[PDB]
Symmetry: C3
Subunit: 186 residues, 3 copies
């Protein structure tokens, strides 16, 4: 079976914008669909949470349990980006340092929230159980491994692993040739 | 949108005690609520689980996916403690050594469950995707980083990271001041 | 207060096979029950996902949030095997190298999915927040620590930790007697 909303159910959600062949679990949470644009051929799985400003392009899988906290600044994924299960992407984060109170029970003037657009460029893949922090551009074709923590921007076409991640090898570009192949045959 | 119970449904859950301005997700799970006590200005998000003895004070966020397995001995959080997404706090665990059978499918006399009260003191923040094992006090003002694992009590006012955690630098104490300033404020 | 199906609703799911004393959360997701079999005395908790080909023996707990993506080649667990919360087992994963396109939105010609049966032998325990990848045999009596990642088969009766896992000590085998002793009671 599957848990995906109908085309009929989907247009009732109220997305800023939703494309063709979009498959979204009835078990995801979508908060403020008003600020969420989704392109074509996108699958969002069980127990995802998308909240605040989120832009997804086309050909992207958001695997189960993944939370995207877009806040005001937003999270944007370009085409052919994918995110494996249990990832968190934060576009805002509280100050852990001891210099500020923390979290949504507390008025902003006591906190020191860090906020910044998070961008995943084309062909980015994020491995399972990973965390991406605010104000981070994940460069084109970057792979980050499972269980990775990314606190700053990542250079294009590299593979990274660890907490926090380190650059371990080049990502191959064959994928770009297959993109063009795939598209050409449509 | 939002997924919270109204103050009216909350009253029907049958909590040991629940204060005001409590926002609990309808997508969270609550088992044995008659041993669960929640103070004022608490938020518990989608997909959290609270099970068995759990005591939360005030000005606390339990972010999404976080499981608090309080068992019979309990987990207690003091005021201004917050737990980030996908954290687990166990007050009991099975013996992994090979010296016992394991899990809820096996009866106790063949197991060797390790149990003990867990306490998160005031101003503790627990980073996302972290695990706290039983019989542990997380010190006053401690921050535990993301993806960290805690098996022992932690000294006050430090930041710890890793699996298992190590101390990396003092937590700043400004928040004590901010706590007074904020509380004055009302 | 628990969230399990009755034995009656269980039969309405359409498992290849379901034993007795099987406690499955209504909050778990089960996809393609037709290829899933479960033996006796098994508990599957909230927000679990079982997808594709999955075979569970007896006396096994699959804890909250755990995802078993059995695909076509399958995941098998033998008796007395248990998986702690927020674990992922994959029988298939995409190629992260950059030599292929990725994920369920892309046709198979353009991908290079690696596939392989995952087997957990008797008495295996997998710690919370762990990830097991395809084509892996976890030998009998293996314990994998929390927050660990397994890409290769594991030697029987050892304890392994880390990302990727390294062997750290033997598992005790007192478990083997206890099993005999307990089964006698039955
Ligand atoms: C990143 C990954 C692609 C690396 O695979 P690889 O290219 O086969 O690299 P190796 O296995 O040789 O590892 C290279 C180095 O990185 C380390 N490493 C590999 N993956 C790591 C990870 N996730 N975290 C930390 N270290 C990692 C290895 O220990 C090795 O270190 P060394 O050079 O110090 O020995 C793979 O390990 C991974 O993390 N895959 C994620 C799969 C996934 O999440 N899939 C979702 C379902 S599609
Ligand atoms: C713990 C944290 C606050 C430390 O950040 P920082 O004070 O800026 O410290 P740095 O990034 O300089 O790192 C200091 C050391 O700890 C390591 N480190 C930092 N965070 C780590 C983590 N979570 N796990 C393991 N190692 C970590 C760094 O590698 C560095 O090691 P080194 O001195 O051996 O090089 C931050 O890394 C973190 O984990 N934040 C969690 C945020 C979160 O979960 N938010 C939830 C939503 S509000
Ligand atoms: C694997 C585990 C059982 C080991 O515990 P232990 O036998 O008491 O071993 P120790 O705590 O002495 O650690 C031994 C070594 O392994 C390292 N280690 C222990 N657990 C680790 C883990 N989960 N990840 C990485 N390293 C780990 C230690 O740092 C130590 O390293 P060193 O030899 O380099 O100093 C335990 O740490 C663990 O992970 N338990 C998982 C519990 C769980 O998930 N329970 C689910 C609820 S029932
Ligand atoms: C996870 C999930 C599955 N399903 C249904 C519909 C699907 O067609 C079917 C199988 O989905 P699946 O996710 O088990 O299998 P796949 O479609 O192969 O995808 C999975 O394996 C890949 C190698 C990974 N890259 C993905 O991250 C992982 O989700 O089950 C749902 O309806 N909702 C879900 O959340
Ligand atoms: C996650 C979640 C959200 N919501 C709704 C109600 C909320 O007011 C709204 C916004 O929630 P949000 O969590 O997206 O955004 P914030 O309210 O800023 O909270 C979040 O960012 C912080 C900087 C972190 N420290 C928190 O751990 C993180 O959860 O969405 C729910 O109703 N239920 C939920 O579980
Ligand atoms: C997690 C969960 C709990 N429950 C209900 C019925 C249960 O009998 C009761 C308590 O179960 P619990 O998981 O809170 O507690 P326990 O039955 O002790 O089990 C737990 O502690 C062990 C030491 C760990 N090995 C397990 O991984 C952990 O799940 O709550 C549910 O109905 N559904 C659930 O998903
Ligand atoms: Cl999760």
């Amino acid at each position: 079976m599957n848990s995906f909303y109908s085309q009929e159910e989907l247009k009732k959600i109220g997305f800023l914008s939703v494309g063709k062949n979009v498959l979204i679990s009835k078990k995801a949470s979508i908060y403020n669909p008003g600020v969420i644009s989704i392109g074509n051929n996108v699958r969002i799985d069980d127990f995802c949470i998308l909240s605040g400003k989120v832009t997804i392009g086309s050909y992207s899988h958001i695997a189960a349990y993944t939370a995207l906290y877009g806040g005001e600044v937003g999270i944007e994924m370009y085409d052919f980006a994918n995110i494996s299960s249990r990832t968190i992407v934060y576009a805002a984060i509280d100050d852990f340092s001891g210099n500020a109170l923390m979290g949504p029970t507390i008025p902003n003037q006591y906190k020191n929230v860090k906020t910044g657009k998070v961008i995943l460029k084309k062909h980015v893949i994020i491995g399972a159980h990973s965390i991406i922090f605010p104000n981070v551009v994940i460069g084109e074709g970057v792979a980050v491994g499972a269980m990775s923590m990314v606190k700053e921007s990542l250079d294009d076409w590299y593979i990274y692993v660890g907490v926090p991640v380190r650059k371990i090898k080049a990502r191959k570009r064959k994928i770009v040739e297959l993109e063009n192949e795939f598209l050409k045959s449509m």
